[PDB]
A paper describes a structure:
It captures the free energy released from reduction of ubiquinone by NADH to pump protons across the inner mitochondrial membrane, support the proton-motive force and power ATP synthesis. Mammalian complex I comprises 45 subunits: fourteen “core” subunits, which are conserved from bacteria to humans and sufficient for catalysis, and 31 “supernumerary” subunits, which are required for assembly, stability, regulation, or fulfil independent metabolic roles.
Here, we have used the canonical complex I inhibitor piericidin A1 (referred to hereon as piericidin for simplicity) to determine the structure of complex I with a ubiquinone-analogue inhibitor bound in its active site. Piericidin-inhibited complex I was prepared by adding piericidin to the enzyme during turnover with NADH and DQ to ensure exposure of the inhibitor-binding state. Density for a bound piericidin was readily identified at the top of the ubiquinone-binding cavity, where the ubiquinone ring and first three isoprenoids of ubiquinone-10 are expected to bind. The piericidin headgroup binds adjacent to NDUFS2 His59 and Tyr108, the two proposed ligands of the ubiquinone headgroup. Because piericidin lacks a second carbonyl it cannot form a second ubiquinone-like hydrogen bond to His59. To accommodate the piericidin, His59 has shifted by ~2.5 Å; this is the only difference that could be identified between the piericidin-bound and active structures.
Author numbering:
A (entry chain Q): 47 to 133
B (entry chain s): 28 to 68
C (entry chain E): 5 to 216
D (entry chain F): 9 to 436
E (entry chain G): 6 to 268
Write the structure that this text describes.
């Protein structure tokens, strides 16, 4: 239920072919950008870094949860359907 | 008087006394409220 | 003890149980005891009534109560596990209880428990092979003054001693369900050493009345 | 206004607390009840709450809070819901027998006082929740209610009054936690006896989501004659802040254990000596006393000779009054065994929804058993004190407090006995 | 308007009535620890871990359930609240079983991380734990109930979101056992979401059973193709394979919930 792993804009790369190593079965690669992750306090910083280093980017906007009206008294209503049958 | 015990009727109560009396009392009691609803489902 | 159910041959969803035609009258009275909605309030009296018609609560009873009330059965299972006055396993004709909280542990309750063990030949939580008596150690029961006490099918025997429960048991075995109350010189909560609180007549109406 | 504990029978507000005259109507009517109830009701609701606030009547259940203030929390009109009155009779705390002894032997006081409380407040009806083990008492009460309905004191015209009332009797199923204000309400609603968080308060949303004010038996049973005799008269007895009569249950290690109505602020020693004649072996043989039932700490005999049976006094003595169920120990009984038994009880009677009383009560139970056997070391005593203080104000209901307070009372006044048992077990 | 000025460690914040302390502090950035409250389920203050002092009130309050009043300062990093959290963690971890390397919610446990931040580092518990009978729900949800913390975050889901009402609590005390009183296949189209709801690993998934661990996993944000709802999804890989599926959070679709097919 924690949200601190959010709050920082990251910049990943597209994934590429991994394959079974014929000896032991390890996962191999032919790209070095596989384990690549950067972090940016904001978004324009990330667009800037990408435009600067020559990468075509797709930006996924910030997803924030809707605020909500909680009430511990709605669980014990006379008329509503929030009257929970448990406790 | 004040010489003996006079809550004596409870020495001969059955199992269905409380419920028989609530039954006899349901006649006297008034209509009840209504939440405009049959259940919270 | 368990708080989980496993379908025995005896206890199962097809173990037979349906209320009698009069208990249904009592049930609809109980449902009139609460508003039109919130008819789920009658779970406690209706389950107690089923227990009172069969002695114990099979799963069949716990589900027929739900069917009658149109409550989910799980809520009934919750309610039956929580409250201890419900017998989720079969018991005898005389369900005996003994208080062992301090106001009655402190007036020789273990003595009564020992005498009630040896006189019956059982351990504490066991039931007799004739399925007549049982025994359990429970908490307070609201008669802490008359400290050494018991409860035998919704009646109290209080202020008692070993001889005055041996006599009780031998009176129960021959069918004479005896008179409840203090098995001593007392008849109620009053001090055994004569009256000390009030001995004059109580005053009539209109006494000490304020204007109005 | 000094050293007043003794009184006479004109003031005995529980004239038949021993079942010696009659419990039915014909016989109770002589003892001054149902007398001027129409005039009481039609006098006004605010007049009743004024009588209450002038009487200084604190809640004669466990938590003593001034009524009048409590009952005035739903004087406001109804915003589209009915109002209800729950009378509490789940007399489950150890030592407490007074509500039983009034339930039988004087139900009509309760009935008329409950009516008076409803009309002082607003209430379509009332729900007299009573313990499941009190079958015969509840049946006496149902018979009394039936006689009242028949005689015309309740129903479509409650003693006239232009006000209609009903009185229901809900029957519990054997759980001490269902004495709480909110576990009681949920049990009436048809669920487990699990308290609520408070807020919400029962006066805005309570039973069936409707306003309620929960009240104890005597708290209401003394209401109608208070209205009938004034708050000046009820407040004249007792100290200025905690006034009135008081039922006193006495248990354990005394020659004549008894229930008594007495004057509040009476000394504990006057109470024990006059009624329930001297403890076994006399005062010198006294070791410790619990003034409440079990949710109050111990007293060491150092402050038994110089202490008044009040809320304020026992609070000043790092203790508290509850339902005033005196319990006595007399040097011939292991005390740690008694408190371990009390904690075994508070473990059995926990509901379990909030973590502290779910686990820590079981901690303290196990540790106090280990202290009884002596299989511990004194570095755990302050650890268990810390466990108590963790449980205290971290709970939904005050059963964690009631579990933690006897522990503190024993650690504060009887620590060297724990030390001795530990060193004995260690040597052997 | 219908606003309220509230302070959080002094810092002011404007919130509506009907809110709580947890939401007020979230508007600042602080999230209060928690094991019972979810933000999509009915409130039940059963963990007592959301405890904060107010600057002059004598005791602490459930921040998940207490509505916030005009003119309040919420003290989150005060010694009273920290003492409360340490005690609550002591009690939670008292009877909890040493099954962290077994448990599949091993590097995903809120209990771990909350013991690591908001809890002590030592057990003063010298007594025997308990052990609870396990339940055979079905082929998906693997119940190991010797470790349930009795938070009721599952019964509320099953009653309010799945609309099932076949899950509850049996008994009381430590002996309270969550689940059914009987053998019943909790077999619904929203049943695998309890695996995400239960912060503890009291119930996990059987397909993912014992396979991987969260630090090993790379996570690619994809979508679903089973139904036409467009439920946003996280596909978790491990060395070029697919290990499990998880929901994403989008409030217009897949409100933290996904069907049992696509997971
Ligand atoms: C665990 C617990 C059990 C309680 N049991 C009772 C009880 O059995 N009878 C009672 O009158 N009050 C009991 N109380 C206190 C009630 O809250 C109180 O009686 C009620 O609020 C009415 O207060 P009053 O004295 O002002 O009428 C209990 C409280 C707790 C925390
Ligand atoms: S203190 Fe005990 S009885 Fe009270 S709510 Fe918490 S767990 Fe239940
Ligand atoms: S839920 Fe699993 S990982 Fe978390 S503390 Fe319990 S055993 Fe350890
Ligand atoms: S099974 Fe999980 S979600 Fe359900 S009560 Fe236990 S810890 Fe909470
Ligand atoms: S303590 Fe034994 S009856 Fe109350
Ligand atoms: S998060 Fe508030 S009590 Fe659980």
């Amino acid at each position: 239920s924690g949200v601190n792993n959010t709050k920082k804009w990251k910049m990943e790369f597209d994934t590429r072919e991994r394959w079974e190593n014929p000896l032991m079965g390890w996962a191999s690669t032919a790209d070095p950008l596989s384990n690549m992750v950067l972090t940016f306090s904001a978004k324009e910083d990330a667009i800037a870094f990408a435009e600067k280093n020559g990468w075509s980017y797709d930006v996924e906007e910030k997803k924030v949860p809707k605020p909500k009206s909680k009430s511990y008294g709605a669980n014990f209503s006379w008329n509503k359907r929030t009257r929970v049958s448990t406790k | 008087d004040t010489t003996t015990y006079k809550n004596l009727q409870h020495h001969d109560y059955n199992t269905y006394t409380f419920l028989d009396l609530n039954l006899d009392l349901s006649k006297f009691r008034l209509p009840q409220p209504s939440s405009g609803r049959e259940s919270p489902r | 003890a368990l708080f989980v159910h496993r379908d025995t041959p005896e206890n199962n969803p097809d173990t037979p149980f349906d209320f009698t035609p009069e208990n249904y009258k009592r049930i609809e009275a109980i449902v009139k005891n609460y508003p039109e909605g919130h008819q789920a309030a009658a779970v406690l009296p209706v389950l107690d009534l089923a227990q009172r018609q069969n002695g114990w609560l099979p799963i069949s009873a716990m589900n027929k109560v739900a069917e009658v009330l149109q409550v989910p059965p799980m809520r009934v299972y919750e309610v039956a596990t929580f409250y201890t006055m419900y017998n989720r396993k079969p018991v005898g004709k005389y369900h005996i209880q003994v208080c062992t909280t301090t106001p009655c542990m402190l007036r020789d309750s273990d003595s009564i428990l020992e005498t009630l063990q040896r006189k019956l030949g059982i351990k504490v939580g066991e039931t007799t092979p004739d399925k007549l008596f049982t025994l359990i150690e429970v908490e307070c029961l609201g008669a802490c003054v008359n400290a050494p006490m018991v409860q035998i099918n919704d009646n109290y025997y209080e202020d008692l001693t070993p001889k005055d429960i041996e006599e009780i048991i031998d009176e129960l075995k021959a069918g004479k369900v005896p008179k409840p109350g203090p098995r001593s010189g007392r008849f109620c909560c009053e001090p055994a050493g004569g009256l000390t609180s009030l001995t004059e007549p109580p005053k009539g109406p209109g006494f000490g009345v304020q204007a109005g | 206004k000094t050293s007043f504990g003794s009184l006479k029978d004109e003031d005995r507000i529980f004239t038949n607390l021993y079942g010696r005259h009659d419990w039915r109507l014909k016989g109770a009517l002589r003892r001054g009840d149902w007398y001027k109830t129409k005039e009481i009701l039609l006098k006004g609701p605010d007049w009743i709450l004024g009588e209450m606030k002038t009487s200084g009547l604190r809640g004669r259940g466990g938590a003593g809070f001034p009524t009048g203030l409590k009952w005035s929390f739903m004087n406001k009109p109804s915003d589209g819901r009915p109002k209800y009155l729950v009378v509490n009779a789940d007399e489950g705390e150890p030592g407490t027998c007074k509500d039983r002894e009034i339930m039988r032997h004087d139900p009509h006081k309760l009935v008329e006082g409950c009516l008076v409380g409803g009309r002082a407040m607003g209430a379509r009806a009332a729900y007299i929740y009573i313990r499941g083990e009190f079958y015969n008492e509840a049946s006496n009460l149902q018979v009394a209610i039936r006689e009242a309905y028949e005689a015309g004191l309740i129903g479509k015209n409650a003693c006239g009054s232009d006000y209609d009332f009903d009185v229901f009797v809900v029957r519990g199923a054997g759980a001490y936690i269902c004495g709480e204000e909110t576990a009681l309400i949920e049990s009436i609603e048809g669920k487990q006896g699990k308290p609520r968080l408070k807020p919400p308060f029962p006066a805005d949303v309570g039973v069936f989501g409707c306003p309620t004010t929960v009240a104890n038996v005597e708290t209401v049973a003394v209401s109608p004659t208070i209205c009938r005799r004034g708050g000046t008269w009820f407040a004249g007895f007792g100290r200025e802040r905690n006034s009135g009569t008081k039922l006193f249950n006495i248990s354990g290690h005394v020659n004549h254990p008894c229930t008594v109505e007495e004057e509040m602020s009476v000394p504990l020693k006057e109470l024990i000596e006059k009624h329930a004649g001297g403890v076994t072996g006399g005062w010198d043989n006294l070791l410790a006393v619990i003034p409440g039932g079990s949710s109050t700490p111990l007293i060491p005999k150092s402050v038994c000779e110089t202490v008044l049976m009040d809320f304020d006094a026992l609070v000043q003595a790092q203790t508290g009054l509850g339902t005033a169920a005196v319990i006595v120990m007399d040097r011939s009984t292991d005390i740690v065994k008694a408190i371990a038994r009390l904690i075994e009880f508070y473990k059995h009677e926990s509901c379990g929804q909030c973590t502290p009383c779910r686990e820590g009560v079981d901690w303290m139970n196990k540790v106090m058993a280990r202290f009884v056997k002596g299989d511990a070391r004194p570095a755990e005593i302050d650890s268990l004190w810390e466990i108590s203080k963790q449980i205290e104000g971290h709970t939904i209901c005050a059963l964690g407090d009631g579990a933690a307070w006897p522990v503190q009372g024993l650690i504060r006044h009887f620590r060297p006995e724990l030390e001795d048992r530990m060193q004995r077990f260690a040597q052997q | 308007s219908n606003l309220i000025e509230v302070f959080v460690d002094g810092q002011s914040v404007m919130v509506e009535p009907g809110t709580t302390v947890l939401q007020a502090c979230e508007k600042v950035g602080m999230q209060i620890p928690r094991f019972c409250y979810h933000e999509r389920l009915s409130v039940a203050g059963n963990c007592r871990m959301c405890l904060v002092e107010i600057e002059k009130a004598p005791k602490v309050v459930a921040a998940c359930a207490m509505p916030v009043m005009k003119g309040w300062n919420i003290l989150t990093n005060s010694e009273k609240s920290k003492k409360a959290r340490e005690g609550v963690m002591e009690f939670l971890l008292a009877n909890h079983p040493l099954d962290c390397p077994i448990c599949d919610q091993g590097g995903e446990c809120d209990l771990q991380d909350q013991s690591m931040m908001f809890g002590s580092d030592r057990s003063r518990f010298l007594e025997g734990k308990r052990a609870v009978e396990d339940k055979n729900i079905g082929p998906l949800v693997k119940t190991i109930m010797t470790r349930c913390i009795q938070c009721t975050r599952c019964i509320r889901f099953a009653s309010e979101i799945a609309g099932v009402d076949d899950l509850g609590t049996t008994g009381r005390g430590n002996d309270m056992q969550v689940g059914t009183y009987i053998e019943k296949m909790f077999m619904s189209e929203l049943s695998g979401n309890v695996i995400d709801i239960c912060p503890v690993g009291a119930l996990t998934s059987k397909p993912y059973a014992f396979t991987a661990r969260p630090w090993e996993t790379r996570k690619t944000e994809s979508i679903d193709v089973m139904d036409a709802v467009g439920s946003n999804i996280v596909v978790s890989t491990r060395t070029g394979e697919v290990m499990r599926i998880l929901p994403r959070m989008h409030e217009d679709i897949n409100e933290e919930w996904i069907s049992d097919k696509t997971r």
